[PDB]
Design a protein around this ligand. Sequence first.
Ligand code: NA
Lengths: 106, 115
Amino acid sequence: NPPTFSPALLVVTEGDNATFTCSFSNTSESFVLNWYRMSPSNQTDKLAAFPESRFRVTQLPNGRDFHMSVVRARRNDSGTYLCGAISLAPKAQIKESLRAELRVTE
Amino acid sequence: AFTVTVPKDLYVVEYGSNMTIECKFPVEKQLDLAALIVYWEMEDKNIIQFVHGEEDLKVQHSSYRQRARLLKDQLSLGNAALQITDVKLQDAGVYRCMISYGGADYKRITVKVNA
Ligand code: NA
């Protein structure tokens, strides 16, 4: 039951804010939700978490949605992003959204 | 920030040998076991599920029961080291490690089996 991460493509002018939404409803006994950017290789580099910079994760009033927000977006922030729900109990599991791409222009 | 790291992303391993691949995680003074979870998987098969110092064999993909293990004496050093014996062609691919220990992260490792 993978999370969703939208919009799947997002163009913004540098200095503006950039807001994805990660939606994940899960019945997991113990879990965390992480925001990843892909490295210049395909390595998952953690940017932030719910719970636990300009990379801010915020649960919304309806509860199943979260804003992953890049504040005051730089140009070389441009790249690939995703949210990864990690269940810790009873069964450890990693669930990833499809990858979204962020373009920041001059 | 709890982050996991890998020494290298890609390992070349000889067919028919034993391999070890690793993910590193920060550890303070001593290891709190009860606060530690370690998971390895490959291609959605579950290899290691180590939860507070106990392998849960129930949830392990049964073809690894005997050939896979986490090096227990490396954990206090901040090293999650998965070791698989008798590496074959099928063991090539992308492995994922997740460690949870105030709180969580994961990484991917490519294994290339040279034969
Ligand atoms: Na050992």
